[PDB]
Every structure is written in C-alpha cells, then in structure tokens.
Design an enzyme around this catalytic site. Structure first.
Site, PDB file in Angstrom:
ATOM      1  N   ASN A   1     -11.943  98.619 106.313  1.00 36.69           N
ATOM      2  CA  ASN A   1     -12.992  99.632 106.568  1.00 36.69           C
ATOM      3  C   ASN A   1     -14.076  99.795 105.509  1.00 36.69           C
ATOM      4  OD1 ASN A   1     -10.285 101.416 107.935  1.00 36.69           O
ATOM      5  ND2 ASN A   1     -11.847 100.401 109.196  1.00 36.69           N
TER       6      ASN A   1
ATOM      7  N   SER B   1      -8.084 100.951 109.622  1.00 33.88           N
ATOM      8  CA  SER B   1      -7.578  99.638 110.152  1.00 33.88           C
ATOM      9  C   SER B   1      -7.577  98.572 109.039  1.00 33.88           C
ATOM     10  CB  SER B   1      -8.437  99.149 111.316  1.00 33.88           C
ATOM     11  OG  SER B   1      -8.386 100.021 112.443  1.00 33.88           O
ATOM     12  N   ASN B   2      -6.602  97.664 109.092  1.00 32.32           N
ATOM     13  CA  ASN B   2      -6.580  96.482 108.231  1.00 32.32           C
ATOM     14  C   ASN B   2      -6.628  95.224 109.079  1.00 32.32           C
ATOM     15  OD1 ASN B   2      -5.928  98.245 105.955  1.00 32.32           O
ATOM     16  ND2 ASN B   2      -3.824  98.228 106.739  1.00 32.32           N
TER      17      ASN B   2
ATOM     18  N   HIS C   1      -5.798 100.948 112.906  1.00 29.55           N
ATOM     19  CA  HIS C   1      -5.344 102.326 112.716  1.00 29.55           C
ATOM     20  C   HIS C   1      -6.053 103.227 113.746  1.00 29.55           C
ATOM     21  CE1 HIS C   1      -4.645 101.060 108.238  1.00 29.55           C
ATOM     22  NE2 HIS C   1      -3.654 100.662 109.018  1.00 29.55           N
TER      23      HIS C   1
END
Lengths: 164, 546
Positions: B269, B1-2, B23
């Site tokens: 992350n 994930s962002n 994500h």
C-alpha cells in the site's frame, strides 16, 4: 435458454463452474453465490438501490457504517436511471451476457430456496434481482476510491444562509 | 494488502511465484468469495471475486497468477470554487459566473408507526461534479465551496477489464490487456508467470494534469495535507486530454509506473517508489506516485526479500503466518532498557514484565505484551522527535529506528507514554494470564473463534483489524482471500484459504469451516485441474438449466 451450467463443489464449498458461453457461466456463478450468500447480496443491493430507510428506517446503518438516509441519498444520486442506462449501453456483449446469466442464476436459487442455507427467507427485501441491480453494485464499488469516500460530505453540502 | 511476485532469478525452482494477501472487510459488499470459472478452450481461471461481480478479481490460470493492492495514486480531484460575490449558488470560471445545477432525489423512509414518508433532498452540482462539505475544512460559505470530480464515474470499462485479465496468458499478455483498456479503478497489479517474470503495475484510472500546470493548479495548503485539490476558478486547471489515454482526462498508460523484473516486486500500500529498491520508481506526477517513507509492512517484506538467497513457497507462507510485529524491532529494544532503568517504578512493573516476556508476535499464544505495546505505540506516535534515527531518505529501508533516550525530554515523555499505556491496559480489567488469542476473535453464531494477526500499522504482515464488542476484540477486516501460487510441471499449484469462509449465512456448512483452519493457520490446496478436483472426496456436482 442459453442458461445452462455445470457446477462442481470441492471442499469448503468452493464452486467450479463450467459453461459454453458467458450467459451459462453467469448462470452458474449467480446460483452458486446465492446458495452461500443470498441474504448478503440482497442487503447490499438494498443499499446500492438507496432503499435502506424504506425497509429499515432512519435509525440504522449500512454495512459500510453510513446512516441509512444519507446512504440512500448518495446511492439514489449515484445510481440514477440515466447513469445506469449509459453504463449498460457501454458494456460489451460478453459482459452483458455474464450479468444476464448471473441475475437468472441467483433468481433460480431464490425460487427454490427452502431455508437450508438462507436465514432471511420471507423478508420483503429478499427478492428477484435484475441486471440493473448488478450495475448498482458495480458502480458502488467503482467509486470507492473517489466520490464514495465523500458520501457523507456530498449529503452535507448545502448553501449558506444569512449568517455572519 | 500485501503482494509479492518472485521471478526466475530468485525462486527456488527458477519459475514464477506469487503471494497474494489482500486486506479486505470480513463482511458486506467487499467480502471475497472463491470460485473457478471455465469456458472450455478459452477461459480457465480461479480465485476470488466480490459480491455480484461475475469475474475473478484476484486469481490464477494455467501460466499466470495476479493480485492487487490499494495504490497511493489519486483517483479524483477536489476543486476549490470561487463563488460569485453576489450569489453563493453561483461560481466563477475565468471570471464568468455560472449557476450550480440542482438535482433532487426522493427517498422513502419507514417511520416508527411503520408507514412510509417521502424525503426530498437537493444535490448541488458544478461542471466538475457534486459539491462536498467537511465542516471546519471544506466549507461552503460566501467565498468558496468544493466540488469533487471522480475519474472512475466515466470508467465504464471496469468489468471488461477483469474479464480480460481472466483471459490473460502470461505477464506480457496481462500487461498488454491492462494498458490497452485502462479499466482498473484504484489498485496496483502484481503478477508472476511460469516463465519466471515478475510484474508490478501502478496502472489505474488517474486524473491527468500536464507537468507545467501542477504548480499553478494545485491548492498548496490542501495538497500539503494529502488532498488532490485544484483551482476550480481557472479553466486551464481542467484535466488534460491526451489521445493515447483510454478515457478523456485520465493519465495515459505510458506515464504510469511499471516494473518488469526477474527477481522480485512487492507492494504493501505504499507508492511505486520502492517496489524493488534495486530499481527505484521515480519522476512521476504527484497525483501518481511520490517518494514517501514506506510503512512497516513493506519495510518488513523488503527486510526478508533483499539479498541473494533463493525464495521458497514456504518462505512467503511464513512471512504471513509468523505474525511478527515488525514495529517492535524499531522501538522495543530501547523500550526494554528504559524498563530496566526504572525498576523502582511501581506503575511500570506490570507493563515492563509483560513486554520483556513477549514473543514480539501476534500469535494466538502471544502474551499481553502485544496489548501493552499497541497502547504505547498509539502514544509514541504523537511525540515529537522521539526517534534516535529519524527517517533518512538516503536510508529508506532502515529508518526510523530507536528511541532518543539520551535526550532528557524524550526520556520523560516516553516514560509517561508507557505509564499512560499501562494505565489504559490495566483499566480495561482483562487478566494478565490472558493471551492475544483469548482477546481477538470472530463470532460465529453464539460461538467465538480465536484469530491470529494484528494491525498492519504495527508492521504485522498478517494484518487484522478489530474493534471492542462485548468483552472481546471482534475482527472486522484484514487477511481475507489468501493465495500462494507456484508452477510445477503438472500445472499451477495454489495454496491458501478464505479466512472468513465461503458463506456469510450461519445456516451454511461453509460458515466457519475455513475460519477454524485460519485460526490454526493451516492453508489448503486450491484444486484447479480436473485431476485435483476429481481427487476431492467432498466432490459434489449439479447441472442446471432453464
């Protein structure tokens, strides 16, 4: 009653649920979600109940790619009646109401479903859900950063025999 | 994930801005679903949620937008048990032998003949929790076993926590609500508000051990391998209690990393450490946050975010849609010169041509160079001391960088790695005229839709994970719910998509509609105000009761 919601859908089937309280709000969410995803939720509830082997046999896997039987043992262990009751007891009135409404809204869609957006109509595992089923799903997700990552490891843990 | 939050000091409009790019899987129990919830006068929130959860997980409201990323904090500890020398079903705590508890579960199994059999299975439990076995690493023999204590098993606050987040007004209120309840299981939280505050919180449920106990209570070999393992034969290694914590044995909120700025915060992350390099987050428990080299997604984001230039909504959108394979920046220049040094090598020609022609992207139109690059990198990752500039803690944003070609052994091994990668690619039998979008797809019925993006481990911000199924790479996870929120005068402006579409059912009109759009990278308005909702020509309405 207390179960009333107004739902508007915009492009791409995005629902906008309006209600006067959490029970009505849940009612709308559960109904809208079922219209799009009844089969998915039904399947994942079977998983969280530890009933995959019962419906699908030992050869299959869950959507998490766990073997059905080890998955079932893990969820039967995780979601024991005592654990679900303690979890429910700790919930605020607002959360209890959201979940109650959600279960009613989902079940309302199931009563009316004619297959228009539901591919699994007639399957024995497509059935009315309870607030306990929503708790099972919540706890499944809750432990994804913890013991859920060791599901296979927990199932594999047996004491040694008489070996060298 | 962002996640990227931008504040008043850096945004083009002087107000807050948030890019949410979680994500997640494209199927199953963590498949996101879009929805907008309103109880007029007291709740008005929109975003995406998980199957069966009647709250918004990632979303926005009138003055606030928030998202989450998986954190690097531990959310459980393993305990090494010292077994009773006389009985492997007993274990020692302060030299006293305790019995394991035995809990049986019974499962029904459908056989070939279609009839049900009952299977009974024993789960052994210690005072810490259930025993776990990883053959060859965490065994259960006559000397030791391992139990697992999960901190979130006692977290009954999780649903209340997101319901509370859904009611938050601005960044300060969101921080208060999360710190007060400590119900977030295993994610960071990043947020921005209309007033231009940007917030990062590593505020989750984390086992607490006072600093003085860590050296004595850690299992050194296992901790060195990234496992939160403690000595389970010493009662002093129980999780510490602090009255300020919302749950006994978890870390109090004041001890967890928070950054509140008016420029930016980001996370991809990695740990809290380089959330904003101008203000490093340091000095936390190793169970919480460590100063570890950042992954290429974060290195990529920081390379676009550092500096004085104003950040536009378009900028953050393009960080996703560019599909830039950032890891190529560190290795591809030196790889191409190895290619030019070895033009007489027959086994290298196709790889070197494909790599030289490649646009360094994971676009639909990107050439086979991306495939060659992936297979090379999987082998490059295995080589020792192949970086020209190895990781430098003093230069955490710019290292590692380059291939150590001037070292004779490295040159041999990197050339061999490319030769082997090329062999693997050409063995797969796919043509060379084939583009990335011809390979990576999402199946919808009997049809396939080309999907742009690539694995996060190669520094593609638009991370997409896929696996071989038939003749194609089938997408399984990655970019999922996309939300980009700004706060112009009229109300929040949200733009994005749900990559895999609202419905998992092939019969639904909403099975592939947003997936077609995701393929073309055409993000859409997420209508939030009554005006926006009313303007939609597809508007449908149903009122229900019972």
């Amino acid at each position: 009653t207390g179960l009333a919601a107004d739902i508007r859908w915009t492009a791409y089937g995005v629902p906008h649920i309006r209600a006067k309280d959490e029970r009505g709000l849940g009612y709308g969410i559960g109904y809208a979600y079922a219209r799009d995803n009844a089969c998915l939720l039904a399947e994942e509830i079977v998983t969280a109940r530890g009933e995959r082997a019962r419906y699908f046999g030992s050869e299959g896997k869950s959507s998490a790619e766990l073997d059905n039987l080890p998955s079932d043992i893990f969820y039967a262990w995780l979601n024991q009646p005592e654990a679900l009751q303690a979890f429910w007891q700790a919930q605020t009135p607002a959360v209890r109401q959201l979940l109650e409404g959600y279960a009613a809204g989902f079940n309302r869609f199931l009563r009316e479903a004619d297959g228009k957006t539901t591919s699994c109509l007639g399957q024995p595992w497509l059935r009315a859900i309870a607030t306990d089923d929503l708790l099972r799903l919540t706890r499944r997700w809750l432990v994804e950063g913890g013991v859920g990552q060791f599901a296979d490891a927990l199932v594999a843990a047996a004491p040694p025999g008489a070996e060298k | 994930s962002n996640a990227i939050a931008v504040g008043s000091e850096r945004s083009a409009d002087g107000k807050g801005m948030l890019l949410a790019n979680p994500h997640y899987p494209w199927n199953g129990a963590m498949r996101f679903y879009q929805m907008h919830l309103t109880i007029p006068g007291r709740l008005d929130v929109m975003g995406a949620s998980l199957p069966g959860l009647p709250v918004v997980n990632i979303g926005f409201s009138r003055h606030l937008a928030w998202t989450h990323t998986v954190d690097t904090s531990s959310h459980f500890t393993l305990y090494r048990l010292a077994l009773d020398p006389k009985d492997p079903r007993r274990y020692l705590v302060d030299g006293r032998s305790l019995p394991l508890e035995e809990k049986s579960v019974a499962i029904e199994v459908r056989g070939a003949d279609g009839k049900l059999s009952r299977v009974e299975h024993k789960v052994y439990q210690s005072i810490y929790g259930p025993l776990v076995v990883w053959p060859g690493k965490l065994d259960w023999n006559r000397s030791e076993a391992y139990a697992l204590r999960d901190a979130n098993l006692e977290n009954t606050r999780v649903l209340q926590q997101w319901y509370s987040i859904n009611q938050a007004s601005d960044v300060a209120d969101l921080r208060r609500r999360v710190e007060a309840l400590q119900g977030i299981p295993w994610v960071n939280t990043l947020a921005a508000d209309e007033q231009g505050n940007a917030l990062y919180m590593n505020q989750s449920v984390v086992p607490y051990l006072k600093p003085e106990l860590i050296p004595a209570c850690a299992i050194p070999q296992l901790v060195a391998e990234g496992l939160p393992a403690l000595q389970g034969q010493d009662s002093r290694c129980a999780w510490s209690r602090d009255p300020a914590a919302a749950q006994a044995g978890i870390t109090p909120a004041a001890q967890l990393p928070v950054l509140l700025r008016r420029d930016f915060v980001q996370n991809s992350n990695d740990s809290a450490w380089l959330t904003n390099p101008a203000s490093p987050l340091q000095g936390f428990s190793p169970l919480v946050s460590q100063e570890k080299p950042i992954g290429p997604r974060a290195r990529y984001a920081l390379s676009r975010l550092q500096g004085k230039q104003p950040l536009e909504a378009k900028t953050l959108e393009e960080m996703v849609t560019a599909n830039h394979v950032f890891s190529a920046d560190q290795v591809l220049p030196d790889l191409l010169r190895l290619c030019r040094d070895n033009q007489g090598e027959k086994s290298l020609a196709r790889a070197c041509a494909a790599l030289a022609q490649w646009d360094r992207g994971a676009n639909l139109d990107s050439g086979s160079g991306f495939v060659y690059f992936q297979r090379f990198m999987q082998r490059f990752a295995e080589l020792d001391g192949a970086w020209k500039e190895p990781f430098d803690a003093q230069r955490p944003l710019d290292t590692p960088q380059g291939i150590a070609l001037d070292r004779p052994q490295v040159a041999t091994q990197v050339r061999q790695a490319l030769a082997d990668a090329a062999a693997e690619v050409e063995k797969s039998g796919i043509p060379d005229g084939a583009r990335w979008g011809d390979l990576q797809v999402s199946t919808r019925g009997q049809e396939r839709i080309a999907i742009p993006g690539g694995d996060g481990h190669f520094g593609v911000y638009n991370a997409i994970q896929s696996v071989r199924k038939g003749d194609h790479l089938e997408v399984v996870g990655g970019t999922s719910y996309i939300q980009l929120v700004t706060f112009p005068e009229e109300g929040p402006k949200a733009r994005g998509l749900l990559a895999f579409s609202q419905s998992s059912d092939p019969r639904s009109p909403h099975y592939r509609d947003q997936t077609e759009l995701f393929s073309r990278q055409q993000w859409q308005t997420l209508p939030f105000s009554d005006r926006q909702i009313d303007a939609d020509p597809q508007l449908q309405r149903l009122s229900i009761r019972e």
